[PDB]
Amino acid sequence: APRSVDWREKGYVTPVKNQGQCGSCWAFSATGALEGQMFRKTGRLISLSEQNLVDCSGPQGNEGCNGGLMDYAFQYVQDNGGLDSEESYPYEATEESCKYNPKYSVANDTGFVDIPKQEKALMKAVATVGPISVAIDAGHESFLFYKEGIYFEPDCSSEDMDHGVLVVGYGFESTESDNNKYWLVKNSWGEEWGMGGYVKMAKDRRNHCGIASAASYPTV
Ligand SMILES: *C(=N)C1(NC(=O)[C@@H]2C[C@@H](S(=O)(=O)c3ccccc3Cl)CN2C(=O)C2(c3ccc(Cl)s3)CC2)CC1
Ligand SMILES: [Cl-]
């Protein structure tokens, strides 16, 4: 495999978005993964509607601005036969009645793949598939106030993930020091957070923060 991967370099990734004051991280993770797989299919990068997921995927198990699962979002797109563009169904950061309109659907999915709970399996998927939805433990002040460098939190959990994000690659920092690898992660907290909205999550450090515990992507 390559020593570093960055799917932004191939046009798979929309700019950083901001979920605002709604607990819709799961929806941004899911649209990021589906944006990448739709691009893999068609060669067209089209921003997808998180609002459509927030408002409409309750029957699949999601809970709007109070949380959800990326796999439930993928199941919704499959069940629903489509997902509207960001343009047609703009983001409001509040849960409303479903306004899905099939006229403006620009994406589909046929299922989803759950990667096994192994950083090696996650690496193979990132190297070959595209951006991957992942669950992480973001429940520490260190994450909230992250600015730069490889994020490592000694108290991070590999089981109590609480935040859905998107792995768009991996790499390493030049150093003689032990443990210099990271996952390149797109967050949904705007470019004002982290490294222009991204975080380098420690890689190959005992499944740090659970990044390989609930990784998945949609089939299209
Ligand atoms: C995002 N803004 C918030 N976080 C969530 O909605 C997260 C996203 C997933 S998770 O934590 O990434 C996850 C954990 C374990 C297995 C798979 C995943 Cl994808 C779930 N989540 C939650 O807050 C949970 C929910 C589980 C089922 C739901 Cl429906 S919501 C409590 C774990 C802050 C909202
Ligand atoms: Cl939130």
From Swiss-Prot:
Zn(2+) 3 binds at D71, D114. Glycans are attached at N108. Zn(2+) 6 binds at D160. The active site is at C25, H163, N187. Zn(2+) 7 binds at D162. Zn(2+) 2 binds at E50, E86. It comes from the Eukaryota. Residues 176-178 form a propeptide. Zn(2+) 5 binds at D137, H140. Zn(2+) 1 binds at E9. Zn(2+) 4 binds at E92, E96. Disulfide bonds join C22-C65, C56-C98, C156-C209. This is Cathepsin L. It comes from Homo sapiens (Human). The gene is CTSL. The chain holds residues 114 to 333 of 333 of the full protein.
